[PDB]
Coordinates of C-alpha atoms in Angstrom, one line a residue:
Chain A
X1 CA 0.0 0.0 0.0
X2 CA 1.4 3.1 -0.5
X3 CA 0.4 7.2 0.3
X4 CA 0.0 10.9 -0.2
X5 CA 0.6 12.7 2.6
X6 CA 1.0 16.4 2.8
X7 CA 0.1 19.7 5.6
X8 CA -3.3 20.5 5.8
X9 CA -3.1 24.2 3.8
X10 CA -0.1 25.5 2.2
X11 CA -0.6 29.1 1.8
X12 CA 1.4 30.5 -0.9
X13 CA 2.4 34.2 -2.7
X14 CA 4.2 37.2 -2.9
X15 CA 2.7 39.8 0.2
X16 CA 1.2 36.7 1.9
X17 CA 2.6 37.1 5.7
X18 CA 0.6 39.3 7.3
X19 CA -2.4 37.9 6.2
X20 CA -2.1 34.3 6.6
X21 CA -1.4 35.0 10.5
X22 CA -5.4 36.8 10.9
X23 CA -6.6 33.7 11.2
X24 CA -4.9 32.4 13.8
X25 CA -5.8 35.9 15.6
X26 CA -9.8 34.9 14.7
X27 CA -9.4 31.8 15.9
X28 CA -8.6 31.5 18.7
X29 CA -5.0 31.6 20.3
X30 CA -3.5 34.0 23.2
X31 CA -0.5 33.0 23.8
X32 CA 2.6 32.1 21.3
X33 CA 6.7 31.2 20.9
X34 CA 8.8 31.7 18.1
X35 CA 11.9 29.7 17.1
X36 CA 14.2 31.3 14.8
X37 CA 18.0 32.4 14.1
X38 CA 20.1 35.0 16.1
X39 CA 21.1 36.2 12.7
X40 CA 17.2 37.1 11.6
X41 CA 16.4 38.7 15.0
X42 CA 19.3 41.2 14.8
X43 CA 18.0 41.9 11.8
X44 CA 14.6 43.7 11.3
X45 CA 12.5 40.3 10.1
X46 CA 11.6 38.8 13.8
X47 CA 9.3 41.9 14.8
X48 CA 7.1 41.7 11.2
X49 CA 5.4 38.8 13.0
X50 CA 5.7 40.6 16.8
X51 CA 4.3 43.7 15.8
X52 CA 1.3 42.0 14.2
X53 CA 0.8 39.8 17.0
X54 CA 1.2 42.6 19.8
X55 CA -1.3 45.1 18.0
X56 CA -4.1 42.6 18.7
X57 CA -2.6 41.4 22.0
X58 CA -0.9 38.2 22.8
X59 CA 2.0 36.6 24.9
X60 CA 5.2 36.8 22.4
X61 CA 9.1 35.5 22.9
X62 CA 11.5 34.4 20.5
X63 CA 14.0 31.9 21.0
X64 CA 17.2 33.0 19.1
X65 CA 19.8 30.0 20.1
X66 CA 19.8 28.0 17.0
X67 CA 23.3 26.8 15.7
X68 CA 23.8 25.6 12.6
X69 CA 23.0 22.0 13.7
X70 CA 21.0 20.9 16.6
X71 CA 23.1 19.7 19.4
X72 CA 20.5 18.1 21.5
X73 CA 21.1 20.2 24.5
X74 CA 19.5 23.7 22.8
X75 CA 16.6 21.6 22.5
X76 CA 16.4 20.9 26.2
X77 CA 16.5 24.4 27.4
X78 CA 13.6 25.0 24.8
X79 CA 11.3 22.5 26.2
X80 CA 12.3 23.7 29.7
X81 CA 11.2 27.3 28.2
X82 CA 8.4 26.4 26.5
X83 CA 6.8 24.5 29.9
X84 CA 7.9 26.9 31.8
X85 CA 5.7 29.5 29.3
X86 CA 3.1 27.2 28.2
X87 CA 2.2 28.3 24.8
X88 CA -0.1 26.7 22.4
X89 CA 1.0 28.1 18.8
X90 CA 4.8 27.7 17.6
X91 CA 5.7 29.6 14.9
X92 CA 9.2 28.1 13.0
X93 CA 11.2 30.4 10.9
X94 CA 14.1 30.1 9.0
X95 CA 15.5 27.4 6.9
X96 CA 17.0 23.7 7.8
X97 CA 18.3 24.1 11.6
X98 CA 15.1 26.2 13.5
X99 CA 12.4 24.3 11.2
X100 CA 13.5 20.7 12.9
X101 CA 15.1 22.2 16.3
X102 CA 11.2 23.3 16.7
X103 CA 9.6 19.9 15.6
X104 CA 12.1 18.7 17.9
X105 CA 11.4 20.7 20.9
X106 CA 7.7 20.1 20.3
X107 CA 7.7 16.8 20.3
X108 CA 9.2 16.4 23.6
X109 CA 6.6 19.3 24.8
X110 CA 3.6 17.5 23.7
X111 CA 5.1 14.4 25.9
X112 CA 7.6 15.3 28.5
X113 CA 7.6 11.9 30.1
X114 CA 9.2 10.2 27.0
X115 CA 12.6 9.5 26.9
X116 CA 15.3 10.7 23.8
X117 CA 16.3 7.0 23.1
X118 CA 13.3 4.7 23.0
X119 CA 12.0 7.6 20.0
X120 CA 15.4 7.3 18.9
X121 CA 15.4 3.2 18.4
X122 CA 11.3 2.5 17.9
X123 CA 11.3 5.4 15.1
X124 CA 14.0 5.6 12.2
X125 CA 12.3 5.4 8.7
X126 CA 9.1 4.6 7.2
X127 CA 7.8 1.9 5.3
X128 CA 7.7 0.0 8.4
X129 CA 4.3 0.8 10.9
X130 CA 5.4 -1.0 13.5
X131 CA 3.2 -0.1 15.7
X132 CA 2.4 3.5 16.1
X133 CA 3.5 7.4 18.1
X134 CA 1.7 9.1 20.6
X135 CA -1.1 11.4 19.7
X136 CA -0.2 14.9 19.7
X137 CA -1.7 18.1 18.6
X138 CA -3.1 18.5 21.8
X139 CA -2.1 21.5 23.3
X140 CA 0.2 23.4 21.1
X141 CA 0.2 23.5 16.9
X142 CA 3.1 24.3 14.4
X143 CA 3.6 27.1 11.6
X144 CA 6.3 26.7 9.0
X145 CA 7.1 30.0 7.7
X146 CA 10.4 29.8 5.4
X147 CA 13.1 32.1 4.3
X148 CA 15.6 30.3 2.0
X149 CA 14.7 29.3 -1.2
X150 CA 15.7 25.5 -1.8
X151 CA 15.0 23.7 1.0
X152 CA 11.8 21.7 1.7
X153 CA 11.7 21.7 5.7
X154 CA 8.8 22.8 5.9
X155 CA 6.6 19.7 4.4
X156 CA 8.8 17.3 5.0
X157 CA 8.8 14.9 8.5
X158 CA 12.1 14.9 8.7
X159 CA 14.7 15.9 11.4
X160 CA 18.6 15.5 12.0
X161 CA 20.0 15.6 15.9
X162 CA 23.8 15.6 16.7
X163 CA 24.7 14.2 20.3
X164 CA 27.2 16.3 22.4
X165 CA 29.2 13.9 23.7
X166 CA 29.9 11.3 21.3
X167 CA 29.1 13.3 18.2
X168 CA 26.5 11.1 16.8
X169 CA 23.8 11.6 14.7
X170 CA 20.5 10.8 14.8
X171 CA 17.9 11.3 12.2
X172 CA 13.8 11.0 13.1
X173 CA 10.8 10.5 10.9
X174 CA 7.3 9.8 11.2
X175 CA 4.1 11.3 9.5
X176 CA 3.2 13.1 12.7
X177 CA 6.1 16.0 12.9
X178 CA 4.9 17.5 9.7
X179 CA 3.8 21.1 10.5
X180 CA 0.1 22.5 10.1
X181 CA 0.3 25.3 8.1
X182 CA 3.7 26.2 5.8
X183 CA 3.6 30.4 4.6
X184 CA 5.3 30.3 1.2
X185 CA 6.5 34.1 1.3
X186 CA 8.6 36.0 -0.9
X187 CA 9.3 39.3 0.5
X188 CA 11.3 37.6 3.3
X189 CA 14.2 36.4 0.5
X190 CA 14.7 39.5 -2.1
X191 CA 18.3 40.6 -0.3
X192 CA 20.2 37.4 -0.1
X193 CA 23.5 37.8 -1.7
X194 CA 25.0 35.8 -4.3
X195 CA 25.9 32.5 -4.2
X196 CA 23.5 31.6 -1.4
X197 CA 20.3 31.5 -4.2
X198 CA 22.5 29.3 -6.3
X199 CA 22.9 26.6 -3.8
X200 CA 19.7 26.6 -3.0
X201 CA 18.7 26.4 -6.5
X202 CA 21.1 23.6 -7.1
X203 CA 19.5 21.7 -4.0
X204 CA 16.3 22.3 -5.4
X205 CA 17.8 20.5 -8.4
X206 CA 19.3 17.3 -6.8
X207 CA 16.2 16.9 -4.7
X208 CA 14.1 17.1 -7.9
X209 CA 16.4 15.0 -9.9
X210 CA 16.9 12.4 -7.5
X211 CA 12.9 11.7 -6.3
X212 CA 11.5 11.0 -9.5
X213 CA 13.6 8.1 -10.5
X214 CA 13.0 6.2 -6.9
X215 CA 11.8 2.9 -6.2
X216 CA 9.1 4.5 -4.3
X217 CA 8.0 6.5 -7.3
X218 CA 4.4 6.6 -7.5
X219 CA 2.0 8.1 -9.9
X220 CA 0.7 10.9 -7.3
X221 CA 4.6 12.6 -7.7
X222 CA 5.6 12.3 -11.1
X223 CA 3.9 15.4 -12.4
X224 CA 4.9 17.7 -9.4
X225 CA 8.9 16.5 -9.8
X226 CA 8.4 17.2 -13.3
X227 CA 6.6 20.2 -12.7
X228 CA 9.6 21.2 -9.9
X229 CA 12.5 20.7 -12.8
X230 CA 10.6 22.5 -15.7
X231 CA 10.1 25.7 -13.5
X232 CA 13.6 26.4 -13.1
X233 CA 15.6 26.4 -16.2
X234 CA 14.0 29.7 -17.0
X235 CA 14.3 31.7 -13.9
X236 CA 16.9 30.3 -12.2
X237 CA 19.4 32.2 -14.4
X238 CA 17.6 35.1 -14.1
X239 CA 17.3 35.2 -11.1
X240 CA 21.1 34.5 -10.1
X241 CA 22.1 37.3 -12.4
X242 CA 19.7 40.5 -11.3
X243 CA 18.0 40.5 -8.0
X244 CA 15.7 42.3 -6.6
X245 CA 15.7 44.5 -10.2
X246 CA 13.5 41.5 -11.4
X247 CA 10.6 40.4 -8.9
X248 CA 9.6 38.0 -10.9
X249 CA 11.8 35.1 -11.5
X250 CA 13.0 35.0 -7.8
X251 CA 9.1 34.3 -6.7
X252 CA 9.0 31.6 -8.8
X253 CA 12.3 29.8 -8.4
X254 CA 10.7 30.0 -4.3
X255 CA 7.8 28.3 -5.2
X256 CA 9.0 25.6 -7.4
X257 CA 11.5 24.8 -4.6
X258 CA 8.7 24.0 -1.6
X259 CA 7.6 22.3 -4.8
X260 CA 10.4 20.0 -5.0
X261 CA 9.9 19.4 -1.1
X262 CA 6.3 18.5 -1.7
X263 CA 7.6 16.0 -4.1
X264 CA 10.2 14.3 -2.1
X265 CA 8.6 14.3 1.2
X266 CA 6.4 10.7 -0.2
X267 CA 9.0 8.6 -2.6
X268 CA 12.2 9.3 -0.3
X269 CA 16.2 10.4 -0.7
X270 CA 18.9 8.3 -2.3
X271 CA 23.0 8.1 -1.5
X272 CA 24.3 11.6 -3.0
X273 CA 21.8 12.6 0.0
X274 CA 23.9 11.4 3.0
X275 CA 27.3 11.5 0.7
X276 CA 26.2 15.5 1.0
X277 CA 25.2 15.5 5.0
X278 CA 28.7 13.9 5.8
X279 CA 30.4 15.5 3.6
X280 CA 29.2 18.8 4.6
X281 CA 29.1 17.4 8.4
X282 CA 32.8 17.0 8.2
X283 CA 34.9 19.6 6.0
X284 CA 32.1 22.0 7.8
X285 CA 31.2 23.1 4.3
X286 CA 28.0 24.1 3.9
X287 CA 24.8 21.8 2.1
X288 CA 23.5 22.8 -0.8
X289 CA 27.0 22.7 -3.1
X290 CA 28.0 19.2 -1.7
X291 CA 25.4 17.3 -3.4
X292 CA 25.6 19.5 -6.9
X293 CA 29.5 18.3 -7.2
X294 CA 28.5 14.7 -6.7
X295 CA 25.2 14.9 -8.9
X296 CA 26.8 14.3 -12.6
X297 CA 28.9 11.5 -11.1
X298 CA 25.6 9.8 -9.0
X299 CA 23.8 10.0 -12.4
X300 CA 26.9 8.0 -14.8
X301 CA 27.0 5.9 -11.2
X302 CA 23.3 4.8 -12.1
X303 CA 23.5 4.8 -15.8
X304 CA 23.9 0.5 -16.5
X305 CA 22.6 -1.4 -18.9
X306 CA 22.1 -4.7 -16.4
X307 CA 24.7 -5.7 -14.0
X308 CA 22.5 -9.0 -12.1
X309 CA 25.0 -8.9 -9.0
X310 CA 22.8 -7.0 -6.4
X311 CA 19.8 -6.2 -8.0
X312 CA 16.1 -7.3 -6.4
X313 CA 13.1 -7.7 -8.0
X314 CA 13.8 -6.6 -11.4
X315 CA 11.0 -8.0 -13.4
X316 CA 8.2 -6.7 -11.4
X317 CA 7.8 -2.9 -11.2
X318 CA 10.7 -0.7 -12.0
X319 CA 11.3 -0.3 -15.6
X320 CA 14.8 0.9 -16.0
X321 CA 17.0 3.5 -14.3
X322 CA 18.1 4.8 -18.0
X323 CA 14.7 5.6 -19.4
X324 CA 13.5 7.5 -16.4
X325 CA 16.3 9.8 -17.3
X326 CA 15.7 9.6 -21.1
X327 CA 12.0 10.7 -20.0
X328 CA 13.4 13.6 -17.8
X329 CA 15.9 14.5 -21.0
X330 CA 13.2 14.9 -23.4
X331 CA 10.3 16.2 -21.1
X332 CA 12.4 18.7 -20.7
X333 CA 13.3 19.7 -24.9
X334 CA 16.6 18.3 -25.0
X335 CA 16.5 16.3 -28.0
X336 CA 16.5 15.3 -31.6
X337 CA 13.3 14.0 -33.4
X338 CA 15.0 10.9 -34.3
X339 CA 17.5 9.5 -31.1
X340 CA 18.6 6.6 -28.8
X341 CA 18.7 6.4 -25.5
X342 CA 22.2 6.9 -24.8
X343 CA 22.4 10.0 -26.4
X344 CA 19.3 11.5 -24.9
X345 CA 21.3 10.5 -21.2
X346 CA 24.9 12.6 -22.9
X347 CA 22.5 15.7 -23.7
X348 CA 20.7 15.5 -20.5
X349 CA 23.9 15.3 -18.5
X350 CA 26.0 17.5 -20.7
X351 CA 23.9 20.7 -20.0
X352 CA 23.7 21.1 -15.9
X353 CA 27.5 21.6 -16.4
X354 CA 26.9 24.0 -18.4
X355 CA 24.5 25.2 -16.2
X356 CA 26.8 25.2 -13.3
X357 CA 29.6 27.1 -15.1
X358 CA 27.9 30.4 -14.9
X359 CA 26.6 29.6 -11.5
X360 CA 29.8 29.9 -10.3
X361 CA 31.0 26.7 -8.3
X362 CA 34.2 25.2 -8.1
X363 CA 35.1 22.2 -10.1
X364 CA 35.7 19.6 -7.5
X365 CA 36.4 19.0 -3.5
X366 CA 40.4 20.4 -3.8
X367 CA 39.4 23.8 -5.5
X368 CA 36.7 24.4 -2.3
X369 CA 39.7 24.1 0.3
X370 CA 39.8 20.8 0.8
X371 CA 43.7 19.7 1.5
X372 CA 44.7 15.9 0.5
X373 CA 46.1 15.0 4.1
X374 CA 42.2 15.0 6.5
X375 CA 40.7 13.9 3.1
X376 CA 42.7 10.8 2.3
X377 CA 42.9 10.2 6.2
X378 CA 39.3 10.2 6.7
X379 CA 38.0 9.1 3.3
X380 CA 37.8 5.4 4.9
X381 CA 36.0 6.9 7.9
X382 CA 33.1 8.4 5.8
X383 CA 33.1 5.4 2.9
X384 CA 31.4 3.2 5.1
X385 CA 29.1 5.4 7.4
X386 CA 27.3 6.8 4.7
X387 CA 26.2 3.4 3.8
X388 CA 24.3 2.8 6.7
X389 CA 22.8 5.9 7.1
X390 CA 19.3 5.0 5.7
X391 CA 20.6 4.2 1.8
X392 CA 18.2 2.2 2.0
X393 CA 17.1 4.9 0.3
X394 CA 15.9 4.3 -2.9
X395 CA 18.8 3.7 -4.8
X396 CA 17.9 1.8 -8.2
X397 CA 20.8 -0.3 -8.0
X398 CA 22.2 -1.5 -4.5
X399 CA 25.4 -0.4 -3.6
X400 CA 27.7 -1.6 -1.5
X401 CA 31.1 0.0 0.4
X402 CA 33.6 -0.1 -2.1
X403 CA 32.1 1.5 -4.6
X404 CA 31.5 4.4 -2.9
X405 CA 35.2 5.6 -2.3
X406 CA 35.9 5.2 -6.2
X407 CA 33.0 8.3 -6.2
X408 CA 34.8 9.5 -3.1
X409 CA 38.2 10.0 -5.0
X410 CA 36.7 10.5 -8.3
X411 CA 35.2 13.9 -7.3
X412 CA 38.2 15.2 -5.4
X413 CA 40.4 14.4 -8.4
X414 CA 38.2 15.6 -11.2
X415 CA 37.2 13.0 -13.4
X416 CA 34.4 10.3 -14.1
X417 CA 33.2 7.5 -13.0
X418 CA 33.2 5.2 -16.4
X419 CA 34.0 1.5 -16.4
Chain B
X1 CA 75.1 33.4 6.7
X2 CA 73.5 34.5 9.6
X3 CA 70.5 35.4 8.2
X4 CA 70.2 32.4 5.9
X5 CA 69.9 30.1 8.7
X6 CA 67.5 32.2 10.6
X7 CA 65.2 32.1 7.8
X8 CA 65.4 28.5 7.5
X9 CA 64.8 27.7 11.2
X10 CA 60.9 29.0 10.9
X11 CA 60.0 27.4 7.8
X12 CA 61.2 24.3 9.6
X13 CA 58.8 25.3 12.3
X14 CA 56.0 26.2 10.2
X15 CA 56.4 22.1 9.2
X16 CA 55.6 20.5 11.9
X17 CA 52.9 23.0 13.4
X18 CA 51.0 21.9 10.2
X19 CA 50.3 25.3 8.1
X20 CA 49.4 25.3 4.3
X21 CA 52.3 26.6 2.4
X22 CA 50.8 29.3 0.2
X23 CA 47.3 31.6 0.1
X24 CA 45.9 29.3 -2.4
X25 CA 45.8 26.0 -0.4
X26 CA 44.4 27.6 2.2
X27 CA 41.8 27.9 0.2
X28 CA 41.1 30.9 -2.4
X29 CA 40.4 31.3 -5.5
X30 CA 42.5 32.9 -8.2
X31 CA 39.2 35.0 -9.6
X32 CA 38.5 37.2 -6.2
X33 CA 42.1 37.1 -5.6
X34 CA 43.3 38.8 -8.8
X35 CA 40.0 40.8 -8.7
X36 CA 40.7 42.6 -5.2
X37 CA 44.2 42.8 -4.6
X38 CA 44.7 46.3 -6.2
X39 CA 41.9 47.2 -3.6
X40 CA 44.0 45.9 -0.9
X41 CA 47.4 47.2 -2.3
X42 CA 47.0 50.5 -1.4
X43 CA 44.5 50.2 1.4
X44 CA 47.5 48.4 3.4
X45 CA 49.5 51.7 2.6
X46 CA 47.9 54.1 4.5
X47 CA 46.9 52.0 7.3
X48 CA 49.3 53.5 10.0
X49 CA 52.9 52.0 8.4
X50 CA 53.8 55.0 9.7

């Protein structure tokens, strides 16, 4: 059996804000908390929600601790703040870190007798409803109101928390930390500097490319990951070039990213996904440029006729990896009117480099800063933890350990993956 | 002489405390290098050297 499951009402357009937030004043809340960045509050952006919600009259405080990760101990003084206040409406803003630091720090509110671990080991992916979660939605309720366009947080039941002690991760996910109500504004992102739109724009691309050609693909995603990639070959460009002289491209490369999250957040995330998060999680570089490094190489990675040595189930639903990508190629007007296959794959790959030549990125790990000593130390620390981190996944073919480091050393070098 | 082997000493040093051995492996690029170093040129001029 397989689902559809998205927030109840996704409110969506330029000068949307103000006016998504009246009904929450007509109905019927006194009393409210706000997660967000210490970067946004010194900034004029936090008091455009306070000074809506004081004019009427309610109970406002922002918490503006987050770090770029979650470090499991920020959470605890927000549940000790948020009991200690009692609210009953959380507004998240931001991008990534304050979106699941607030489904985070709600989830323990809603149930403050539960400990960190038994959610940790009973709940670590889906596909498996064994047996169910805790009801919740009692006495609080969750806005999602984002700022960077690229990232799909805000629909997606996803969160990532790092331990203190030991370092280690832990990722969470069940279809009850998905938020109520996402805001899909774009006055809040018109003064974002370049390259920060172009790595979100990239991300927007690998999380479009990557969910359409799943295992978990169903029907009820195609059209909106199609939809996703054909919205941004226009006004992505434009977008990364002017800014704010053109108010129009900017809006929609912002919509047809929580687009992409909408179509990700039901057939899930391959390997170039966790390659990214440790990747990123170790060099501290930031996400969003990771994953558009590895993409070309992910995509010759999956591009086989038929290797039978770890395949499963390969006459009874997927077609072929190859002409999901031929249908991407010429979906999107890439092609002849007379063609193969193999050359629809060499004009669809040959033209996001292109792309990503005048979107200004380096051309592999060494040219971002990344020296040969920690690399080729830790190459074998990272080659076999991103296998386990849920990779399992989707992938079309099933990898296994070694085959990861020839990706590993074939980005940091500068070549292909071709065998 | 003298001054020969003091030079060498801290480059010796500089080895084994683990530094990277020019501005580019530390990690910039050539295009924002080449574009802003007649903005620094000067601007390190009359910054108090005096």
């Amino acid at each position: 059996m397989l689902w559809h499951k998205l927030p109840k009402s996704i409110y969506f357009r330029r000068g949307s804000l103000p006016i998504a937030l009246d009904e929450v004043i007509t109905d019927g809340h006194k009393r409210a908390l706000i997660v967000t960045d210490r970067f946004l509050f010194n900034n004029g952006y936090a008091d455009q929600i306070t000074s809506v919600l004081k004019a009427a009259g309610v109970e406002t405080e922002v918490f503006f601790e987050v770090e770029a990760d979650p470090t499991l101990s920020i959470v605890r003084k927000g549940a000790e703040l948020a009991n200690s206040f009692k609210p009953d409406v959380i507004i998240a803003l931001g991008g990534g870190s304050p979106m699941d630091a607030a489904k985070i720090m709600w989830v323990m509110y809603e149930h403050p007798e539960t400990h960190f671990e038994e959610l940790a080991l009973r709940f670590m992916d889906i596909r498996k409803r064994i047996y169910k979660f805790p009801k919740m939605g009692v006495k609080a309720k969750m806005i999602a109101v984002t700022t960077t366009s690229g990232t799909g947080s805000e629909v997606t039941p996803f969160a990532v928390v790092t331990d203190d002690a030991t370092g280690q991760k832990y990722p969470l996910a069940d279809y009850a930390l998905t938020p109520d109500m996402a805001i899909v504004d774009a006055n809040l992102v018109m003064d974002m500097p370049k390259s920060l739109c172009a790595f979100g724009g990239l991300d927007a691309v690998t999380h479009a490319m990557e969910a359409y050609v799943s295992v978990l693909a169903s029907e009820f995603s195609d059209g909106q990951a199609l939809q996703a990639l054909k919205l941004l070959k226009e006004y992505l460009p434009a977008s990364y070039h002017e800014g704010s002289k053109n108010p129009v491209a900017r809006e929609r490369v912002h919509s047809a990213a929580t687009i992409a999250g909408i179509a990700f957040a039901n057939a899930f995330l391959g390997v170039c996904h966790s390659m990214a998060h440790k990747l990123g999680s170790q060099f501290h570089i930031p996400h969003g440029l990771a994953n558009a490094l590895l993409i070309c190489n992910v995509i010759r990675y999956n591009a086989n006729d038929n290797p039978t040595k770890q395949t499963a189930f390969s006459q009874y639903d997927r077609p072929q990896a190859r002409r999901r990508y031929a249908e991407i190629a010429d979906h999107l007007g890439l092609s002849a009117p007379g063609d193969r296959t193999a050359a629809k794959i060499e004009k669809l790959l040959a033209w996001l480099e292109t792309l990503k030549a005048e979107l200004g990125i380096p051309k592999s790990i060494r040219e971002a800063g990344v020296q040969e000593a920690d690399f080729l130390a830790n190459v074998d620390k990272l080659s076999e933890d991103a296998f386990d981190d849920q990779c399992t996944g989707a992938n079309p073919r099933y990898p296994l350990i070694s085959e990861l480091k020839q990706i590993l050393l074939d980005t940091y070098y500068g070549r292909d993956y071709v065998e």
